[PDB]
Design an enzyme around this catalytic site. Structure first.
Site, PDB file in Angstrom:
ATOM      1  N   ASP A  46       0.834  -1.208   0.000  1.00  0.00           N
ATOM      2  CA  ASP A  46       0.000   0.000   0.000  1.00  0.00           C
ATOM      3  C   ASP A  46       0.860   1.245   0.000  1.00  0.00           C
ATOM      4  O   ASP A  46       1.726   1.395   0.855  1.00  0.00           O
ATOM      5  CB  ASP A  46      -0.913   0.052   1.220  1.00  0.00           C
ATOM      6  N   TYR A  51       2.920  10.527   0.866  1.00  0.00           N
ATOM      7  CA  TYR A  51       4.079  10.115   1.655  1.00  0.00           C
ATOM      8  C   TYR A  51       5.359  10.630   1.060  1.00  0.00           C
ATOM      9  O   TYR A  51       6.371  10.701   1.745  1.00  0.00           O
ATOM     10  CB  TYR A  51       4.153   8.597   1.790  1.00  0.00           C
ATOM     11  N   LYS A  80      -2.870   6.012  -4.225  1.00  0.00           N
ATOM     12  CA  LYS A  80      -4.039   6.844  -3.977  1.00  0.00           C
ATOM     13  C   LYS A  80      -3.840   8.227  -4.574  1.00  0.00           C
ATOM     14  O   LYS A  80      -2.711   8.705  -4.702  1.00  0.00           O
ATOM     15  CB  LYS A  80      -4.314   6.971  -2.467  1.00  0.00           C
ATOM     16  N   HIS A 113      -8.037   9.141  -2.070  1.00  0.00           N
ATOM     17  CA  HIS A 113      -7.414   9.108  -0.757  1.00  0.00           C
ATOM     18  C   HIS A 113      -8.302   9.717   0.331  1.00  0.00           C
ATOM     19  O   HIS A 113      -8.294   9.278   1.477  1.00  0.00           O
ATOM     20  CB  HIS A 113      -6.082   9.851  -0.821  1.00  0.00           C
TER      21      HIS A 113
HETATM   22  N1  LIG Z   1      -6.008   7.613   4.785  1.00  0.00           N
HETATM   23  C1  LIG Z   1      -5.390   6.477   4.484  1.00  0.00           C
HETATM   24  O1  LIG Z   1      -5.653   5.874   3.457  1.00  0.00           O
HETATM   25  C2  LIG Z   1      -4.353   5.912   5.434  1.00  0.00           C
HETATM   26  C3  LIG Z   1      -4.133   6.488   6.679  1.00  0.00           C
HETATM   27  C4  LIG Z   1      -3.168   5.935   7.512  1.00  0.00           C
HETATM   28  C5  LIG Z   1      -2.450   4.822   7.080  1.00  0.00           C
HETATM   29  N2  LIG Z   1      -2.670   4.284   5.866  1.00  0.00           N
HETATM   30  C6  LIG Z   1      -1.923   3.106   5.401  1.00  0.00           C
HETATM   31  O2  LIG Z   1      -1.964   2.083   6.404  1.00  0.00           O
HETATM   32  C7  LIG Z   1      -0.634   1.745   6.785  1.00  0.00           C
HETATM   33  C8  LIG Z   1      -0.552   1.310   8.240  1.00  0.00           C
HETATM   34  O3  LIG Z   1      -1.111   2.287   9.106  1.00  0.00           O
HETATM   35  P1  LIG Z   1      -0.113   3.194   9.983  1.00  0.00           P
HETATM   36  O4  LIG Z   1       1.243   3.212   9.348  1.00  0.00           O
HETATM   37  O5  LIG Z   1      -0.807   4.515  10.199  1.00  0.00           O
HETATM   38  O6  LIG Z   1      -0.077   2.484  11.438  1.00  0.00           O
HETATM   39  P2  LIG Z   1       0.050   0.935  11.886  1.00  0.00           P
HETATM   40  O7  LIG Z   1       0.413  -0.028  10.801  1.00  0.00           O
HETATM   41  O8  LIG Z   1      -1.166   0.674  12.735  1.00  0.00           O
HETATM   42  O9  LIG Z   1       1.315   1.018  12.901  1.00  0.00           O
HETATM   43  C9  LIG Z   1       2.636   1.231  12.396  1.00  0.00           C
HETATM   44  C10 LIG Z   1       3.617   1.443  13.557  1.00  0.00           C
HETATM   45  O10 LIG Z   1       3.683   0.266  14.365  1.00  0.00           O
HETATM   46  C11 LIG Z   1       5.013  -0.241  14.425  1.00  0.00           C
HETATM   47  N3  LIG Z   1       4.934  -1.709  14.255  1.00  0.00           N
HETATM   48  C12 LIG Z   1       4.759  -2.379  13.102  1.00  0.00           C
HETATM   49  N4  LIG Z   1       4.702  -3.711  13.326  1.00  0.00           N
HETATM   50  C13 LIG Z   1       4.875  -3.899  14.654  1.00  0.00           C
HETATM   51  C14 LIG Z   1       4.949  -5.062  15.561  1.00  0.00           C
HETATM   52  N5  LIG Z   1       4.815  -6.316  15.063  1.00  0.00           N
HETATM   53  N6  LIG Z   1       5.130  -4.827  16.882  1.00  0.00           N
HETATM   54  C15 LIG Z   1       5.256  -3.579  17.370  1.00  0.00           C
HETATM   55  N7  LIG Z   1       5.214  -2.468  16.601  1.00  0.00           N
HETATM   56  C16 LIG Z   1       5.027  -2.576  15.260  1.00  0.00           C
HETATM   57  C17 LIG Z   1       5.790   0.419  13.317  1.00  0.00           C
HETATM   58  O11 LIG Z   1       7.119   0.613  13.777  1.00  0.00           O
HETATM   59  P3  LIG Z   1       8.396   0.296  12.852  1.00  0.00           P
HETATM   60  O12 LIG Z   1       8.014   0.727  11.470  1.00  0.00           O
HETATM   61  O13 LIG Z   1       9.454   1.171  13.477  1.00  0.00           O
HETATM   62  O14 LIG Z   1       8.625  -1.190  12.996  1.00  0.00           O
HETATM   63  C18 LIG Z   1       5.041   1.721  13.101  1.00  0.00           C
HETATM   64  O15 LIG Z   1       5.556   2.767  13.937  1.00  0.00           O
HETATM   65  C19 LIG Z   1       0.180   2.982   6.471  1.00  0.00           C
HETATM   66  O16 LIG Z   1       1.580   2.737   6.334  1.00  0.00           O
HETATM   67  C20 LIG Z   1      -0.458   3.413   5.176  1.00  0.00           C
HETATM   68  O17 LIG Z   1       0.013   2.535   4.153  1.00  0.00           O
HETATM   69  C21 LIG Z   1      -3.598   4.807   5.060  1.00  0.00           C
HETATM   70  O1  LIG Z   2      -1.139   8.874   5.806  1.00  0.00           O
HETATM   71  C1  LIG Z   2      -2.327   8.943   5.303  1.00  0.00           C
HETATM   72  O2  LIG Z   2      -2.763   8.109   4.515  1.00  0.00           O
HETATM   73  C2  LIG Z   2      -3.089  10.164   5.710  1.00  0.00           C
HETATM   74  C3  LIG Z   2      -4.402  10.321   5.274  1.00  0.00           C
HETATM   75  C4  LIG Z   2      -5.126  11.452   5.618  1.00  0.00           C
HETATM   76  C5  LIG Z   2      -4.549  12.442   6.378  1.00  0.00           C
HETATM   77  C6  LIG Z   2      -3.240  12.318   6.812  1.00  0.00           C
HETATM   78  C7  LIG Z   2      -2.501  11.176   6.494  1.00  0.00           C
HETATM   79  N1  LIG Z   2      -1.218  11.010   6.997  1.00  0.00           N
HETATM   80  C8  LIG Z   2      -0.032  11.715   6.700  1.00  0.00           C
HETATM   81  C9  LIG Z   2       0.020  12.758   5.786  1.00  0.00           C
HETATM   82  C10 LIG Z   2       1.220  13.409   5.554  1.00  0.00           C
HETATM   83  C11 LIG Z   2       2.364  13.025   6.230  1.00  0.00           C
HETATM   84  C12 LIG Z   2       2.326  11.978   7.141  1.00  0.00           C
HETATM   85  C13 LIG Z   2       3.565  11.531   7.852  1.00  0.00           C
HETATM   86  F1  LIG Z   2       4.690  11.975   7.281  1.00  0.00           F
HETATM   87  F2  LIG Z   2       3.593  11.924   9.144  1.00  0.00           F
HETATM   88  F3  LIG Z   2       3.686  10.194   7.846  1.00  0.00           F
HETATM   89  C14 LIG Z   2       1.121  11.327   7.371  1.00  0.00           C
END
Ligand SMILES: NC(=O)c1ccc[n+]([C@@H]2O[C@H](COP(=O)([O-])OP(=O)(O)OC[C@H]3O[C@@H](n4cnc5c(N)ncnc54)[C@H](OP(=O)(O)O)[C@@H]3O)[C@@H](O)[C@H]2O)c1
Ligand SMILES: O=C(O)c1ccccc1Nc1cccc(C(F)(F)F)c1
Length: 318
Positions: A46, A51, A80, A113
């Site tokens: 993803d 980013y 996205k 997005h």
């Molecule tokens: N609006 C949107 O569409 C949207 C918004 C937010 C996120 N996303 C997508 O969803 C993905 C995941 O969500 P997220 O990155 O916000 O948060 P997340 O996956 O819930 O949590 C990531 C964090 O948890 C840590 N981590 C990962 N695996 C672990 C484990 N097994 N044990 C302990 N800690 C662990 C990582 O640290 P390390 O990396 O240091 O290991 C990182 O700091 C994003 O990368 C992005 O692709 C999309």
């Molecule tokens: O990360 C998503 O998918 C995101 C979606 C909606 C609003 C904010 C979002 N996060 C976001 C947007 C810009 C920069 C960073 C960061 F750099 F902190 F990861 C995280």
């Protein structure tokens, strides 16, 4: 060697139920993570324009293709379209920067997005002099039409949406001249925000759900010490120990058993592997009901606060 279960989309394409998230991380951290992931057996990655790290991801996939570790047809790459690019010539232009950085000739899924259009321009987060987001001219409906062209031309296989409520999905589905349907709605989901009614809704429409921040996004800039903490949640850890698993693995498995795609992010190789080691156990139907009861409607990802603009998704109940 691991393989995530396939979730079939309404297009009959197969979407791996676990994917690697790519939240911003410096510098080549994300590139190795993608390399490690592919090694371990991840095929679903993803990505996002916002980013500004998509080129690293691109280098990684390119190298593993040449190394013969993976073929393209087996990879499932999602990116996205960011809201400041909803205007038609911008959609095509943003997408092309995405597809370039990623060194691909197509995306498996391209997502809206965020539902609200933001002011076009150099800024990705356009704000007034008082901090509030600035709206744009084009709507998500306008963007979708331009995105459908990408499908027509074989640049994208399927479209979807992110951070949409059921009211906005309804508007998309009922749009006149609609060519392609969303194959997924990527939204925040975890045991503090169980999204029951929205998942119910999407599934009832043949739209999959992709859970983001399934670990509670602990590295989010805006976290607070009193913001609840999924990974450290004693009742999650207890269920974990019961299966000889980590809290993170339980949090991931939770979505799997609801038939919900999930994209945990890590740049730590040990964790990347661990996060896909989730097809060797099963939470009991009693453990699932217990986890479902943790819902407190808490959003980790609510930074935008464009609650003043039209189409703010989180005002809706679901
Ligand atoms: N609006 C949107 O569409 C949207 C918004 C937010 C996120 N996303 C997508 O969803 C993905 C995941 O969500 P997220 O990155 O916000 O948060 P997340 O996956 O819930 O949590 C990531 C964090 O948890 C840590 N981590 C990962 N695996 C672990 C484990 N097994 N044990 C302990 N800690 C662990 C990582 O640290 P390390 O990396 O240091 O290991 C990182 O700091 C994003 O990368 C992005 O692709 C999309
Ligand atoms: O990360 C998503 O998918 C995101 C979606 C909606 C609003 C904010 C979002 N996060 C976001 C947007 C810009 C920069 C960073 C960061 F750099 F902190 F990861 C995280």
């Amino acid at each position: 060697a691991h393989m995530a279960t396939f979730v079939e989309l309404s297009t009959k394409a197969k979407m791996p139920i676990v994917g690697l998230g790519t939240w911003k991380s410096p510098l080549g951290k994300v590139k190795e993570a993608v390399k490690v992931a592919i090694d371990a057996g991840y095929r679903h990655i993803d990505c996002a324009y916002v980013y500004q790290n998509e080129h690293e991801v691109g280098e990684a996939i390119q190298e593993k293709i040449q190394e013969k570790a993976v073929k393209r047809e087996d990879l499932f790459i999602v990116s996205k379209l960011w809201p400041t690019f909803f205007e038609r010539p911008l959609v095509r232009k943003a997408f092309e920067k995405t597809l370039k950085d990623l060194k691909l000739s197509y995306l498996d899924v391209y997502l809206i997005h965020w539902p609200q259009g933001f002011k076009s321009g150099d800024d990705l987060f356009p704000k007034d002099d008082k901090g509030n987001a600035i709206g744009g001219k084009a709507t998500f409906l306008d963007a979708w039409e331009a995105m459908e062209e990408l499908v027509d031309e074989g640049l994208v296989k399927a479209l979807g949406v992110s951070n949409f409520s059921h009211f906005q999905i309804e508007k998309l589905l009922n749009k006149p001249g609609l060519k392609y349907k969303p194959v997924t709605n990527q939204v925040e989901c975890h045991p503090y925000l169980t999204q029951e009614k929205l998942i119910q809704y999407c599934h009832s429409k043949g739209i999959t759900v992709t859970a983001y921040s399934p670990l509670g996004s602990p590295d989010r800039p805006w976290a607070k010490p009193e913001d609840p903490s999924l990974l450290e949640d004693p009742k999650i850890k207890e269920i974990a120990a019961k299966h000889k698993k980590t809290a993170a693995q339980v949090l991931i498995r939770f979505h799997i058993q609801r038939n919900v795609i999930v994209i945990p992010k890590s740049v730590t190789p040990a964790r990347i592997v661990e996060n896909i080691q989730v097809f060797d156990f099963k939470l009991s139907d009693e453990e699932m009901a217990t986890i479902l009861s943790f819902n407190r409607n808490w959003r980790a990802c609510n930074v935008l606060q464009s609650s003043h603009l039209e189409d703010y998704p989180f005002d809706a109940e679901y």
